[PDB]
Amino acid sequence: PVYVDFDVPADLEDDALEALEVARDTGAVKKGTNETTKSIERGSAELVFVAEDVQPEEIVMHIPELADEKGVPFIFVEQQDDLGHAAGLEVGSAAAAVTDAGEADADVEDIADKVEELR
Amino acid sequence: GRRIQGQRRGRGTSTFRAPSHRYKADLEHRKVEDGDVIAGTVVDIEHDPARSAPVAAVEFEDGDRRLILAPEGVGVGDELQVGVSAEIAPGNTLPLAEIPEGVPVCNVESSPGDGGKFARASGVNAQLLTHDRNVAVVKLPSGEMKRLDPQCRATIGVVAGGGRTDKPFVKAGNKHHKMKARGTKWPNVRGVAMNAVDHPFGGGGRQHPGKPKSISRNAPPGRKVGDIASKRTGRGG
Amino acid sequence: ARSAYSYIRDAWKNPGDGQLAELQWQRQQEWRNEGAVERIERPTRLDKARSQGYKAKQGVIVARVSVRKGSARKRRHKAGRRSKRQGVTRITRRKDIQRVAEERASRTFPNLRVLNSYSVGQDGRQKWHEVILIDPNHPAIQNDDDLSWICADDQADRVFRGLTGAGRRNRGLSGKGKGSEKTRPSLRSNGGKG
Amino acid sequence: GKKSKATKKRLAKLDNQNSRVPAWVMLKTDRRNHKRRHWRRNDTDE
RNA sequence: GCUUUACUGCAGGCUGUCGCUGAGGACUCUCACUCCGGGAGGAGGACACCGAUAGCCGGGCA
RNA sequence: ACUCGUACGGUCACUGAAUCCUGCCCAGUGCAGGUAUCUGAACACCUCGUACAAGAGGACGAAGGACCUGUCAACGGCGGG
RNA sequence: CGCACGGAGGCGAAGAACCACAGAUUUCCGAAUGAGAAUCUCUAACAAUUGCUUCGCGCAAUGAGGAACCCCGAGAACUGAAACAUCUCAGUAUCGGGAGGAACAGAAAACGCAACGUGAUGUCGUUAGUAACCGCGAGUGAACGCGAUACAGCCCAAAC
Ligand SMILES: [Cl-]
Ligand SMILES: [Cl-]
Ligand SMILES: [Cl-]
Ligand SMILES: [K+]
Ligand SMILES: [Mg+2]
Ligand SMILES: [Mg+2]
Ligand SMILES: [Mg+2]
Ligand SMILES: [Mg+2]
Ligand SMILES: [Mg+2]
Ligand SMILES: [Mg+2]
Ligand SMILES: [Mg+2]
Ligand SMILES: [Mg+2]
Ligand SMILES: [Mg+2]
Ligand SMILES: [Mg+2]
Ligand SMILES: [Mg+2]
Ligand SMILES: [Mg+2]
Ligand SMILES: [Mg+2]
Ligand SMILES: [Mg+2]
Ligand SMILES: [Mg+2]
Ligand SMILES: [Mg+2]
Ligand SMILES: [Mg+2]
Ligand SMILES: [Mg+2]
Ligand SMILES: [Mg+2]
Ligand code: NA
Ligand code: NA
Ligand code: NA
Ligand code: NA
Ligand code: NA
Ligand code: NA
Ligand code: NA
Ligand code: NA
Ligand code: NA
Ligand code: NA
Ligand code: NA
Ligand SMILES: [Sr+2]
Ligand SMILES: [Sr+2]
Ligand SMILES: [Sr+2]
Ligand SMILES: [Sr+2]
Ligand SMILES: [Sr+2]
Ligand SMILES: [Sr+2]
Ligand SMILES: [Sr+2]
Ligand SMILES: [Sr+2]
Ligand SMILES: [Sr+2]
Ligand SMILES: [Sr+2]
């Protein structure tokens, strides 16, 4: 909420998570805030995911601005457990990143473009 | 020295407490959701041990039985009303806004919904003076002009039992019996009649206060006795 | 490159600036309505917790404790006292609020032992600290190479004896040289002059 | 006064403790109850 | 033990200042905070309370 | 605590039923109110000083005091010539 | 066949008594824990607070004691200063909390015989009534080092 500045529609989120699953089964993904943060810094992040139900918020606060001064696009997910399941984890995940997608390059690109229009 | 009587008071020991367990009811304005729709019948008139004045037992339409701070002229059988659209008759309770100016009121609220604070003793009453969209001015029994929220509820009429103060106690026994019903230590020994150790005015070979009686507001407890921050004293001038 | 943790750390270097400021103003409202000791699922400051020995593991607990701000709540003398000993107002306690916080927490969890604690801010009348506690009886910890040291009998009630880091710090044991003459090996052994 | 079952057991013990050192103990030990209590002269507990 | 314009201090009261504490020399506001209200909600409001310090009074007490 | 109390109350004091009455004094002391001007601490601010600091000075000035007024059914006073 | 030498009687070569180790039994109150109570009572009990958790008291923890010693907190006054306020008595007496068989401390953001030097920590001897404090009064009072004792050095957080 303090780091969230734009609302992502449920349908748009569905598109994003579906793309994440195929991204792990084809390309490559990073699970967990630490790994996600390094991707944004190293430049290998194509699309980063950030959960909105993170408590404490400190854990993710930095993403929305780190991704900006690195030109990396990000999208907000409503639930931490859905992001983790999409990434293929039994547990939840505060943040994940698509490091080089796979057969989702078109979808991801569009999703990234849709977010820009959504402010 | 030793702590003065005023200090023993604050400890709230048995001697200084009021016989609450003997008290009847915390006479507060009945709560109503809205719309005003609420009335009751006076079932009886009782003596209130805490105020030495009469109190009306009232049974409401919803079945609630509660003692009420009775104004003068209320009797068994009478129908009392409480709400925004209540009838402007003695015994009824409605916000100061709905109460026409120039009309005597009692048991006035200080903050809307508190249940009544001002003008509750025998015979007293507050005078509702000015209306407004923001404030209703009332003249309390002390003569002070009190600006209040027009939403503050109040009962119409003067409190019952007026004139109680007109008859003298005559003898100590009568005072004794009244005192026994209040949170007060009685009788009263004059400070000047005590030993120096017991009170600032104590000591001396003859009875007279040590220094002058008018004490500063800033005086600490144990010393604040006599004429507390008096703006003047005596009768002349 | 930088750890995600380093960002939580950097944010907390100035709890009155940026997002953290907004966050604190919001949380403190909820904290003021909470109890004295409140167990919490996750540390408010991950970097600090982990840095202090915390682990997302069974037997590791965290609790936020609030203690009143200010000097000693002292009762004035009721018998003869020389002017030096007649004070009340300016007297301060020798244990710091963080240490009081740690103890109040340890008492709430009789079976757990205090591992460490850290500050999470303060309003105008109280301070909050989050204490990391450990269950010395859970096998998850009895087998943890990094934490099983706290399972030793001599670590029982370590907070009440000042064995905590904040405890040792408050006992004036930081310096190994000059200034620590009356503090090491213990305040009591040095006649209580530390 | 009203005695409870326990008070009564103690009073009972106190009364039996008030017995004399049996005749045989004198012979066996080749020669005194230091706890000889009297209802009037002495005073029990409780 | 007691007294006081004895000496020296310590509580306590009053008062300024810092923190809590925010938006647009006097003022508006609401979001912290306080109170009223079962509640919805109302009043108050960056004051008050509380923490800290400074000046004044201070046989109430040592 | 007072208080299931709200000035026809309750707190703090003095005097001490009734009856006839209760003069004069506000300079000192107390209390309270006001106050142009004077005095009045700390923080912040300005000058000097110190590559910083200690420190010196300045500006502003709260309650309080000066000053003014009210008050004796306040403490008390009611003489010499 | 206790202290304890009596009377009656009994036990022991089926090896008793007696001693060592191990085990059985082990009423009621008691931290006292189902609830209450001056050691009893009433109708299934980890009461209370916690951790784990099959979220069920299922598996666990705490409580109280102990001669002093130990560690963390609160903290006098008589007294000395030929009075007394800072100072002193003294961080003493006493109080709150807590561990162990010992505690605490401990592998340098050290020392500073200033070095081309020492090398975790306690403790003992000394340094020394020295430096330092103090109505610079009365009084108060270290450390580095040195000689010894015993010696021991490691693990995380993060980077990846
Ligand atoms: Cl009366
Ligand atoms: Cl502990
Ligand atoms: Cl050396
Ligand atoms: K002394
Ligand atoms: Mg009432
Ligand atoms: Mg009268
Ligand atoms: Mg009474
Ligand atoms: Mg009298
Ligand atoms: Mg007398
Ligand atoms: Mg006498
Ligand atoms: Mg006195
Ligand atoms: Mg007289
Ligand atoms: Mg007199
Ligand atoms: Mg030792
Ligand atoms: Mg017999
Ligand atoms: Mg309230
Ligand atoms: Mg005295
Ligand atoms: Mg008389
Ligand atoms: Mg029981
Ligand atoms: Mg002396
Ligand atoms: Mg001398
Ligand atoms: Mg000393
Ligand atoms: Mg040294
Ligand atoms: Na504990
Ligand atoms: Na010291
Ligand atoms: Na007897
Ligand atoms: Na005496
Ligand atoms: Na005068
Ligand atoms: Na046994
Ligand atoms: Na148990
Ligand atoms: Na259970
Ligand atoms: Na002497
Ligand atoms: Na003397
Ligand atoms: Na001195
Ligand atoms: Sr989770
Ligand atoms: Sr009321
Ligand atoms: Sr009420
Ligand atoms: Sr007198
Ligand atoms: Sr007159
Ligand atoms: Sr324990
Ligand atoms: Sr007798
Ligand atoms: Sr008379
Ligand atoms: Sr005067
Ligand atoms: Sr060594």
Side-chain angles (χ1 to χ4, degrees), chain C residues 1 3 5 39 50-51 58 61 74 80-85 93-95 99 107-111 135 137-138 146 153-154 156-157 160-161 163 168 170-171 173-174 176-178 181-182 184-189 191-193:
Chain C
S3 67
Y5 305 116
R39 172 167 179 183
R50 296 182 64 67
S51 185
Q58 304 176 98
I61 289 81
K74 219 199 175 183
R81 244 43 156 220
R82 52 192 201 94
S83 67
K84 234 280 170 182
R85 311 304 190 188
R93 314 250 86 134
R94 298 173 192 212
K95 274 193 290 191
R99 213 130 105 58
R107 271 170 178 112
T108 299
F109 299 100
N111 58 316
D135 183 5
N137 296 296
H138 197 306
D146 291 344
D153 285 341
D154 56 42
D157 297 311
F160 303 109
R161 301 178 291 123
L163 310 191
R168 291 173 175 143
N170 183 59
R171 293 203 284 156
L173 291 165
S174 296
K176 304 191 64 175
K178 192 209 305 166
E181 296 81 0
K182 319 269 185 302
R184 184 171 298 99
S186 97
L187 286 165
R188 199 186 166 247
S189 74
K193 298 159 193 174

Side-chain angles (χ1 to χ4, degrees), chain B residues 124-177:
Chain B
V124 307
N125 70 80
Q127 203 67 55
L128 177 51
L129 301 185
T130 307
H131 264 107
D132 204 76
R133 293 178 177 148
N134 303 267
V135 52
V137 177
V138 179
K139 191 179 185 189
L140 307 181
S142 67
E144 181 196 315
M145 307 292 255
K146 188 79 178 182
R147 306 185 83 245
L148 286 180
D149 194 307
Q151 196 55 26
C152 284
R153 299 179 289 155
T155 305
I156 299 184
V158 300
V159 185
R164 184 197 59 215
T165 292
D166 302 329
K167 187 178 193 178
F169 285 100
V170 180
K171 56 184 181 180
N174 293 342
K175 236 296 177 50
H176 170 105
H177 295 303

Side-chain angles (χ1 to χ4, degrees), chain C residues 43-76:
Chain C
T44 288
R45 300 174 54 186
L46 236 192
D47 67 299
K48 195 72 176 184
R50 296 182 64 67
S51 185
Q52 287 183 345
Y54 168 97
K55 278 190 172 180
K57 182 166 190 167
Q58 304 176 98
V60 172
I61 289 81
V62 181
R64 179 182 315 118
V65 184
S66 73
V67 180
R68 86 298 183 279
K69 280 175 64 185
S71 66
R73 269 65 190 163
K74 219 199 175 183
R75 299 193 53 122
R76 183 174 184 286

Side-chain angles (χ1 to χ4, degrees), chain D residues 18-32:
Chain D
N18 229 115
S19 297
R20 195 179 185 103
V21 178
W24 64 264
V25 175
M26 303 288 263
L27 305 181
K28 184 180 181 185
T29 65
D30 290 337
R31 308 180 194 175
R32 253 198 167 284

Side-chain angles (χ1 to χ4, degrees), chain C residues 98-163:
Chain C
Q98 168 159 8
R99 213 130 105 58
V100 183
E102 288 184 336
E103 288 180 35
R104 285 177 184 179
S106 195
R107 271 170 178 112
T108 299
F109 299 100
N111 58 316
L112 312 184
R113 294 173 184 177
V114 179
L115 189 262
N116 231 315
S117 74
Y118 57 82
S119 173
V120 281
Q122 61 171 51
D123 61 359
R125 61 208 215 72
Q126 75 205 286
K127 298 183 177 181
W128 288 276
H129 283 87
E130 295 192 351
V131 187
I132 302 170
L133 298 102
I134 304 296
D135 183 5
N137 296 296
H138 197 306
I141 287 172
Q142 292 179 294
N143 293 289
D144 191 302
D145 300 301
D146 291 344
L147 300 174
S148 65
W149 61 263
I150 211 161
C151 299
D153 285 341
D154 56 42
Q155 295 293 336
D157 297 311
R158 65 199 311 271
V159 73
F160 303 109
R161 301 178 291 123
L163 310 191

Side-chain angles (χ1 to χ4, degrees), chain B residues 18 20 25-26 51 117 119-122 163-164 183-184 190-192 199 208 212-214 226 230 233-234 237:
Chain B
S20 302
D26 185 38
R51 308 183 308 108
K117 304 294 192 187
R120 295 176 51 113
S122 289
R164 184 197 59 215
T184 295
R190 289 126 53 236
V192 157
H199 185 91
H208 66 125
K213 306 188 303 186
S214 295
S230 67
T233 65

Side-chain angles (χ1 to χ4, degrees), chain B residues 30-77:
Chain B
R30 219 198 72 104
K31 302 158 189 179
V32 178
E33 316 72 70
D34 210 270
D36 128 87
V37 278
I38 251 307
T41 302
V42 182
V43 171
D44 198 18
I45 297 304
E46 294 171 39
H47 165 84
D48 186 12
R51 308 183 308 108
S52 297
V55 143
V58 176
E59 194 177 302
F60 291 89
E61 292 169 7
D62 51 78
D64 217 313
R65 175 67 176 291
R66 299 157 93 270
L67 285 182
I68 241 178
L69 168 30
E72 184 182 315
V74 173
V76 184

Side-chain angles (χ1 to χ4, degrees), chain B residues 187-191 193:
Chain B
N188 311 318
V189 172
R190 289 126 53 236

